[PDB]
Amino acid sequence: MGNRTFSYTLEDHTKQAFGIMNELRLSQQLCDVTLQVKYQDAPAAQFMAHKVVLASSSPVFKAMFTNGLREQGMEVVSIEGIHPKVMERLIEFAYTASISMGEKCVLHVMNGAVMYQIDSVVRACADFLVQ
Amino acid sequence: FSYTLEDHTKQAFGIMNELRLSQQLCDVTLQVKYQDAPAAQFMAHKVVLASSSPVFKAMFTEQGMEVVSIEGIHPKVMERLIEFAYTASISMGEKCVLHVMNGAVMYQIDSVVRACADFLVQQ
Numbered sequence A: 001m002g003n004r005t006f007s008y009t010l011e012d013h014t015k016q017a018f019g020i021m022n023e024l025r026l027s028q029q030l031c032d033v034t035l036q037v038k039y040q041d042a043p044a045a046q047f048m049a050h051k052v053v054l055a056s057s058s059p060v061f062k063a064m065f066t067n068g069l070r071e072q073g074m075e076v077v078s079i080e081g082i083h084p085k086v087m088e089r090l091i092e093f094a095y096t097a098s099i100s101m102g103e104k105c106v107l108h109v110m111n112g113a114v115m116y117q118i119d120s121v122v123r124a125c126a127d128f129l130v131q
Numbered sequence B: 001f002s003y004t005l006e007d008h009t010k011q012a013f014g015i016m017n018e019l020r021l022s023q024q025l026c027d028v029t030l031q032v033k034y035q036d037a038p039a040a041q042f043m044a045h046k047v048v049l050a051s052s053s054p055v056f057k058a059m060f061t062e063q064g065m066e067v068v069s070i071e072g073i074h075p076k077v078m079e080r081l082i083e084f085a086y087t088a089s090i091s092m093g094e095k096c097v098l099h100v101m102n103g104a105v106m107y108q109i110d111s112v113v114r115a116c117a118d119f120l121v122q123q
């Protein structure tokens, strides 16, 4: 009584939500950006995604997408300086909160994570290197 | 090795909520008309609303900003549901729990329905 308002956090929710966002990415629905990842004259690799989700993972993505002006349809964004396999895992991280690596690719991933200022991935890579 | 950063989705939602409140990257405007109350507009991200509700997901699955009209749900309810989608938290009280529950039912947001029922039964 007394017009008091109560708040309730639903603890399973953000994990289920990200799962749905990842599903939509993989079925290429609602996406508004296509990344064209050109590295060292390999053929360009394409990844579709949602700007709001990439921005939520990376201050670099957030600045890129919120700063200028385009046609507010599907934007094709040229990306250089990072291997597509690295960018693939950084996108997967933004949508899953998980990242996989091996001895042969941890430095690659760390380098990408530094470049996109994904601090939590940088720290996971560090953890991996030291063990 | 595989890592899961257990705090990440909470932090990400924080940022998406910030972008919603600053009206950045939004691709849907909900125009909500109820009874005699003033019309309200809510800008959001279709992918985030879809993440919260099978009804929003079906609704959206067009290019650019889409203006979508909704009738027969009070703007304050819709506002609570949007806030939930971006925070994982729902607010209610004695005099609006049925209204929030109705909204959650309509949008098939089962977690929120259950939280409303829990609240109602506690009274």
Ligand SMILES: *CCC(=O)N1CCOC[C@H]1c1cc(Cl)cc(-c2ncnc(N)n2)c1
Pocket: A082, A083, A085, A086, A089, A101, A102, A103, A104, A105, A106, A108, A109
């Ligand atoms: C850990 C190694 C690994 O799993 N893979 C997957 C299959 O492709 C090769 C290899 C890999 C993974 C990543 Cl994330 C990056 C790279 C890579 N190779 C060369 N140059 C760069 N910049 N990255 C290989």
Ligand SMILES: *CCC(=O)N1CCOC[C@H]1c1cc(Cl)cc(-c2ncnc(N)n2)c1
Pocket: A005, B073, B074, B076, B077, B080, B092, B093, B094, B095, B096, B097, B099, B100
């Ligand atoms: C719990 C009651 C409450 O917190 N509020 C918030 C401030 O506005 C008044 C009141 C409220 C909240 C909600 Cl979610 C809905 C309504 C409402 N009033 C009339 N008709 C409808 N459909 N909803 C009031």
